[PDB]
């Protein structure tokens with residue numbers, strides 16, 4: 001038989017929800033103290049980018065941010081390597097138990 | 100691992116002295132080989148765990 | 150291993166700003182702290198302890214522009 | 229511009245339990261009497277699979293602990309109202325949270 | 329497991345085993361706002377340690 005784990009998967013859903021919302025609203029803990037796009041500007045600043053253009057191209061940066069997130073979302077189509085790595089786990093377990 | 104020296108493994112006794120003092124020598128090897136196979140299987144399982 | 154850690158024991162609710170847009174289209178942001186308002190003066194506090202202090206150039210990082218949601222401070226050319 | 233890409237990391241596996249004597253000698257008492265001289269062979273199988281399932285539980289509690297160390301939340305939050313900051317969309321990342 | 333003690337001496341038919349929810353971790357909560365109030369955010373700053 002296969003026993004269920006000790007925590008639900010909805011509990012780990014709640015834990016990733018808390019760790020995602022910890023970096024969006026006060027007191028901005030997973031954003032490390034400061035607000036979110038403030039922290040993004042300081043991160044791009046530390047690579048060699050002037051704070052002038054980060055203050056000047058802010059909505060373009062946030063649009064590209066949304067676009068990257070959406071293309072991540074719309075890409076689980078039959079050749080995603082992450083889905084292959086998830087399906088390998090299930091196929092390996094099923095083959096070992098049937099054998 | 101020490102408790103495997105008192106299993107019979109299909110033989111008539113787990114003591115080697117009782118097998119070597121109650122059977123003919125061609126009739127004893129068949130019972131000794133079962134003890135040998137069981138003890139070696141136990142040692143291989145232990146070594147894998149380590 | 151023995152691990153020693155910082156640990157608060159009392160809190161206070163304050164209102165903070167994360168940055169100021171200064172006269173001449175400049176900007177300042179705090180370092181490891183927040184811009185607060187004490188007695189109608191812009192001050193700086195550290196983020197692990199409440200202690201307001203003068204806004205020097207050791208508590209800020211300067212920018213020759215400013216972000217669109219900074220707080221307005223024309224009276225601040227201070228130390 | 230800003231490029232996005234995801235990775236996957238696996239942190240657990242299914243927890244398989246085996247009843248040893250029902251696999252070997254399912255219902256027949258002649259087989260159970262014959263298996264009772266192999267002794268502690270089914271007990272070692274049970275103890276190894278039990279210790280594996282214990283390790284799986286310990287890693288699951290560690291992952292759940294790391295996501296929750298030092299996160300303080302507003303008790304007035306509501307994900308149906310607050311799923312957006314600085315025009316960056318977080319609707320697809322949040323589950324349910326708040327008080328209703 | 330919590331038996332009915334001598335002060336909490338029960339007079340009915342119930343079991344001393346209780347089937348509950350296992351919830352090992354939390355978040356600490358603050359009573360503040362999520363949007364800026366007059367340009368300024370609320371925050372909780374330690375004043376002793």
Ligand SMILES: *[C@@H]1O[C@H](CO)[C@@H](O)[C@H](O)[C@H]1NC(C)=O
Nearest residue numbers: 037058217218313314315364
């Ligand atoms: C600036 O603040 C205003 C009011 O809080 C808000 O509507 C706007 O989205 C903010 N913009 C940025 C870029 O932070």
Ligand SMILES: *[C@@H]1O[C@H](CO)[C@@H](O)[C@H](O)[C@H]1NC(C)=O
Nearest residue numbers: 296351352353354355356357
């Ligand atoms: C939250 O969980 C923690 C875990 O240590 C526990 O100590 C605390 O009592 C819980 N608080 C509430 C409100 O459930």
Ligand SMILES: *[C@@H]1O[C@H](CO)[C@@H](O)[C@H](O)[C@H]1NC(C)=O
Nearest residue numbers: 162303304358359360361370
């Ligand atoms: C604290 O929370 C209570 C209810 O939980 C609410 O009535 C009160 O207004 C809150 N205080 C502040 C300062 O927001």
Ligand SMILES: *[C@@H]1O[C@H](CO)[C@@H](O)[C@H](O)[C@H]1NC(C)=O
Nearest residue numbers: 157158159198374375376377
């Ligand atoms: C912090 O708390 C301790 C004990 O409660 C007290 O003796 C000490 O004076 C406090 N610190 C300040 C700065 O009030």
